[PDB]
Amino acid sequence: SRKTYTLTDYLKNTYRLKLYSLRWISDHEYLYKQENNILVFNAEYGNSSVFLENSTFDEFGHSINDYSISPDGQFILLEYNYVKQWRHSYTASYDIYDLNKRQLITEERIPNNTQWVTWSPVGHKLAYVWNNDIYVKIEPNLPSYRITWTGKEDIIYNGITDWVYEEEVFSAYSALWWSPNGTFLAYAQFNDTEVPLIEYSFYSDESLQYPKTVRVPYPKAGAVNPTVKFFVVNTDSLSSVTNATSIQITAPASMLIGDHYLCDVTWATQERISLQWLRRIQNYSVMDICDYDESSGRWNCLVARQHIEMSTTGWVGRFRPSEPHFTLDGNSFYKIISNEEGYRHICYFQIDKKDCTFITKGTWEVIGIEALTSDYLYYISNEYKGMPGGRNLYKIQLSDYTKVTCLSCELNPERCQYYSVSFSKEAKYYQLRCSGPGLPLYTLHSSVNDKGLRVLEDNSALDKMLQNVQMPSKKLDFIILNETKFWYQMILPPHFDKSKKYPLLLDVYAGPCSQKADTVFRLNWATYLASTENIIVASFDGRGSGYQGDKIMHAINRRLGTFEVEDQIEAARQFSKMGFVDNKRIAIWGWSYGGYVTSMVLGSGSGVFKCGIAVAPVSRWEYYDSVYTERYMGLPTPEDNLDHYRNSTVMSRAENFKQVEYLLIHGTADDNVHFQQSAQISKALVDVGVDFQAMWYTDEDHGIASSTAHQHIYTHMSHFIKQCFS
Amino acid sequence: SRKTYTLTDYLKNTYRLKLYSLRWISDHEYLYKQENNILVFNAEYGNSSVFLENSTFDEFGHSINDYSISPDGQFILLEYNYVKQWRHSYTASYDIYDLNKRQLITEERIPNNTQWVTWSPVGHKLAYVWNNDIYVKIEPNLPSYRITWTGKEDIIYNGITDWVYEEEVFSAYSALWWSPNGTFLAYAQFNDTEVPLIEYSFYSDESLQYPKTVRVPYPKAGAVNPTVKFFVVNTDSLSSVTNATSIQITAPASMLIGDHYLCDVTWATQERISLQWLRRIQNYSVMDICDYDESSGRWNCLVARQHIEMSTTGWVGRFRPSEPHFTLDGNSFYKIISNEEGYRHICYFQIDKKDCTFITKGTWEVIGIEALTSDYLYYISNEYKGMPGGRNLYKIQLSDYTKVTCLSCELNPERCQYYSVSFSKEAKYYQLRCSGPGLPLYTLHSSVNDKGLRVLEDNSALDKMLQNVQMPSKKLDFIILNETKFWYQMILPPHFDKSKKYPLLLDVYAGPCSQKADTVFRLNWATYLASTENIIVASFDGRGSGYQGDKIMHAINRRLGTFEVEDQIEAARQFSKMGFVDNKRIAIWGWSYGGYVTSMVLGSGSGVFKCGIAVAPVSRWEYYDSVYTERYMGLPTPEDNLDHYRNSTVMSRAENFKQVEYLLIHGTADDNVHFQQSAQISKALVDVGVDFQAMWYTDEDHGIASSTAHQHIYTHMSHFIKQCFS
Numbered sequence A, B: 001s002r003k004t005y006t007l008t009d010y011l012k013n014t015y016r017l018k019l020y021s022l023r024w025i026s027d028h029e030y031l032y033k034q035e036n037n038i039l040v041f042n043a044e045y046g047n048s049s050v051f052l053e054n055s056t057f058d059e060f061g062h063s064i065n066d067y068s069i070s071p072d073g074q075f076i077l078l079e080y081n082y083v084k085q086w087r088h089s090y091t092a093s094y095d096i097y098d099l100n101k102r103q104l105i106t107e108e109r110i111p112n113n114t115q116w117v118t119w120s121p122v123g124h125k126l127a128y129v130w131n132n133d134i135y136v137k138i139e140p141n142l143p144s145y146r147i148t149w150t151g152k153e154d155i156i157y158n159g160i161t162d163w164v165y166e167e168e169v170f171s172a173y174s175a176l177w178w179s180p181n182g183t184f185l186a187y188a189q190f191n192d193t194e195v196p197l198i199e200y201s202f203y204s205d206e207s208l209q210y211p212k213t214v215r216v217p218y219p220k221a222g223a224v225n226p227t228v229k230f231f232v233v234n235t236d237s238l239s240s241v242t243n244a245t246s247i248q249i250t251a252p253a254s255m256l257i258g259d260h261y262l263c264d265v266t267w268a269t270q271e272r273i274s275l276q277w278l279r280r281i282q283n284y285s286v287m288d289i290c291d292y293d294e295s296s297g298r299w300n301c302l303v304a305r306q307h308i309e310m311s312t313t314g315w316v317g318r319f320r321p322s323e324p325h326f327t328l329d330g331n332s333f334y335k336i337i338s339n340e341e342g343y344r345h346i347c348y349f350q351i352d353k354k355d356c357t358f359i360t361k362g363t364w365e366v367i368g369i370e371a372l373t374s375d376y377l378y379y380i381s382n383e384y385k386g387m388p389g390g391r392n393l394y395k396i397q398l399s400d401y402t403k404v405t406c407l408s409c410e411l412n413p414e415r416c417q418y419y420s421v422s423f424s425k426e427a428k429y430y431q432l433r434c435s436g437p438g439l440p441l442y443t444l445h446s447s448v449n450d451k452g453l454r455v456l457e458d459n460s461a462l463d464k465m466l467q468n469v470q471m472p473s474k475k476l477d478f479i480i481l482n483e484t485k486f487w488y489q490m491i492l493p494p495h496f497d498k499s500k501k502y503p504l505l506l507d508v509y510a511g512p513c514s515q516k517a518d519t520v521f522r523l524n525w526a527t528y529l530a531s532t533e534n535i536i537v538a539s540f541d542g543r544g545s546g547y548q549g550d551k552i553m554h555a556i557n558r559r560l561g562t563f564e565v566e567d568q569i570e571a572a573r574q575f576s577k578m579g580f581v582d583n584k585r586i587a588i589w590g591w592s593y594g595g596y597v598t599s600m601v602l603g604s605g606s607g608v609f610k611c612g613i614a615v616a617p618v619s620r621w622e623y624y625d626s627v628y629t630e631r632y633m634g635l636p637t638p639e640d641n642l643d644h645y646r647n648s649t650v651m652s653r654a655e656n657f658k659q660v661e662y663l664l665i666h667g668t669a670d671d672n673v674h675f676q677q678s679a680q681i682s683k684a685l686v687d688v689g690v691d692f693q694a695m696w697y698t699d700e701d702h703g704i705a706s707s708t709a710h711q712h713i714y715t716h717m718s719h720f721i722k723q724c725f726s
């Protein structure tokens, strides 16, 4: 029969997945951008209109990579001159377009090299960060109001996060939060003054005669962390002659006693904001609820209104404490916390009451709270069919927790077992996004009766195309390690024959709270390996995995590099015993945390694996950042966990690599997992006389995602795997 | 028959070459160190005595890596705490041992971290450099005299060379020169104030949490060069309260007009010193002869006594203008210069006469002047048998240039065709060092009649050992490219059969004035490749090669990366046509300049080569240092030679690498050929979609010579070559 899914198909993206990215602008309408122009859709009937023609900016004179329409509908923020920084951060130039007078605003424009910009929640106010300082614009064409003056490159950050906060706690560059109606603008300030710098070379274009040395404040495990402060400013009480006044919100006392972090800020009402703080020993977190004092101007956070969230088995939250969802009056809220049984479920709080009431329970977990009406609470969980790798939308009646309704489970159980959702402003309508096991399916629904309004995108075009190619299949199942079940998935070659013995590749990540076994549909390298090369690509979620309760997730607490790598070995051991696996050809590969695990496995001396590839792996935890490492490892001091820090390195296992074929890959400009980590691995291997393969990627970071580097690394890795298996 | 010469033999040095390193202390005696103690030998009779027992320093409390006996015989300088810097530079601790009172001097000792130390030519005076300043010690136990105060790390160097002067012009760290009887101490001062810095990471031991950034003043092609000044101080006119007075010798005017270098300093007499200066455009050099003015204290360099040495076909000298050899009265001198025919021969000068008289001539070259008596001039050349890859000692009668006698040619023409020599103080005796084609042979001779006194070392032990192993053979011959003959050598596998077709590896260097085809005996990687793997390892000396006249050497003037790489291709092309070469398996490899050539060849699109290895290659000349690059390339400016600078890069040929298997290797701590050079090569290959192999060596420099890295790189390269050939 026809052709298979080739490497070129993957690298050249011959089989494209269609999406349906919409942006709700009201409770009844959403904007649906296209290649050319933006349309506005009526959710109820489905009729649309052109919001603005593609031609509108034919002669803008700049390539626009992104737009942003004020909640007003009145203005359009045009982003261009994009220059990526870290995972989320970047700088760009901005122009505002008046949709009213259809004129491009040319006076008092936003400066170039702006670090961040955001419209207020309602009007058309603007808040942006430039040169590490915050600026507010009440009107697009009016002069800016400077809010901060302490901004200082690599030292003081106002309104934006520093390297570690961007990557580890906020997953964003932005560090500013508008109040609901736009009156107040809250923000955090980070001080990196004494944070050590990581320095590495950047070669740039061939014409650069001397390499440049990049240096960024980066706190490695146990090093000096950046400090943080929080402020709130009334954007309605600013002159044009008076330097704005930011009111600081400090403490709590339980946090100030030592190193700590700001891990969450969520507005409750127009005059109430909630803040969550975490101790450097991410065992203990505290939430403060603060109110604006009218005839005083300051903010007060009544103790008694603060809630403590701690863990005795591990750290707090999956990656960081969950965000609260306040009721209309801000007098109560719902937030996901760990059960007394170790499972994450929704707990209901009264802002001034210590104990909360769990509204959901069971041996499954709530992934997230998606919407909250006065009537219901909508959330996504993996309860359905008891499979932790599945996701479905559910709604629970606030009047009776007994009444929970699954809104996605039965829509199409064969094709859809993994959903994400997007609600309109007042949750009157919602879009469901099915991403597997079948082809992605996007639909619209109305909340009143949960009626399906219509299909938005069903990827029928991709479907027709794929029936002419021998596609691999996916098996999602579990095995049983002493009492507990652990899930795994296998990308099976077309025409799988359980009678035959196939070579197997263990695709691994295995970081804390990770999940590599799910019902998501994917077209990746594994697809090619199975379809064209007839290689089985498996993934296993062992100890340390997430979404299955803390007994499993917290198993590797203070013990990274132990049970999670061991279970990976044990899984392969069980796979090679299912009958369709050639135990003479079992390989393993991983990126990031998976690179670390891959390396630890290859250096375990288990003998189970013939070869393996590690891409940008961590080699010893003292080299990785403080916020992430310490969360699971504690401090690298003899009084705390130094011994295990020293026992879990890859280099200490160098000798065992004599029994395997290892390929080490790393980008030279990796600001996240520093090239240093692989430099130390290679050195320990050389010092022990172990031969291996290596490949550096000049000027590529942790993603090694530039077009050319991407195709090149996957091509290099394909040759390596085939050589090992053929 | 028995075994072959294996990789392990090479890496573990199972077959050791014996040497006979002696150190003349007089015109009749020499010191011959041993593993344990130092002996003193009488050259005439051969009888010896113990100069000092090994036990002498049993409880010194430090490992002594080197000794240095004052020309006095009175003191012994003990060097320990050695810490290597660049190719020649390093720091160490020193202790002086009084051989008279057999006591270790403990007062006013030389400081630790001393950069350089040297005894005066006769007495026991000491001159050392510490913290970039010069210090003189008239007596080992007496306080030091500070000579300079401008010393400043990475900025001002007194008595020592900066990075580029150490590597490119003086081939030494030392930048100070004692006068004949020790009265005067001359020295150079280097200013790196505005020299750009090369910065790169050094990872150090696993325990280093943050990598360190190394920065060294390094002028890349066309950048700002360091400036130099010269001084002479009378070490007999120093108090202990008065700051010493250094008399500066400036100019010449023809040099001061622009950028220039100090390329040689040679004392003529007790009160006369010669200096050679070179313009940044190393086309023109000027020699100054300066005399000490008694009743004035300063030094005067009479114009009329200065000699200009320039070249119209290329640069001056092989690497730098040759050194002069003055007659007893310092009124005349002999120095090697290029012929009117382009061949380097000895020219005789009268210090105050413009034109010199050539005392030797012919289509061969004088390699170096080894000794000068009032009677004869001893020199080494490649005249014998007309083979430029051979070396022999000759003596020419100063009274009649017609009388030239070869002193080594016939000693043992079968085993010895490559000699080096070592004369006693007054050239009364000399040791000959035969290094090929047979096993190294060391002998002693007396100059009066050139009588052979006795054999010092004949490597008979190694000889007995090697007759039990299938050793490869070496073929030295030449081919003819349009009128001119170009030499090559081939390491042939044991039992070579011209009827069989062997795979061939082109071992290449090819830099300007290089020679890879000679009669030297070697036990290296090539030995293993031929003996055990039956691979022919050839080397070719094409355009640009040295020791054959300027028509050949200067052929690549201002044109690096052209004829020298082309001829390498042409050679392989002719080798694959000799009948015993499998043209389907021809590879090429090189280090340093040879890495550059290897890369240029592999990217030439010739198709002649299947695979190739480049170790620490230069990729584009603007990345290499000024002194070396500019000597052959001129300046990288549109007014000079920028176009060719841009036309001779490796990356510009990236596309052509699709036809070959390439292995790129480079040490991350390469202070000479910066990792940057390979980083840019890999990047251009990735951008073009070319797959290749790579290997970085963490913390290794240009030599990748640490024990573990050395074994590892040659092991990695052996696998690569075998895979390409098998």
Ligand SMILES: CS(=O)(=O)c1cccc(-c2cc(N3C[C@H](c4cc(F)c(F)cc4F)[C@@H](N)C3)ncn2)c1
Residues within 6 Å of the ligand: B167, B168, B169, B170, B171, B319, B320, B511, B591, B592, B593, B594, B616, B617, B618, B628, B672, B673, B702
């Ligand atoms: C006889 S002498 O007159 O004492 C005298 C003096 C002063 C220098 C010399 C000399 C210098 C030399 N080199 C080669 C070298 C080099 C070239 C490359 F292309 C590289 F990629 C890396 C390199 F290290 C460069 N760094 C200097 N090779 C031989 N002889 C010889």
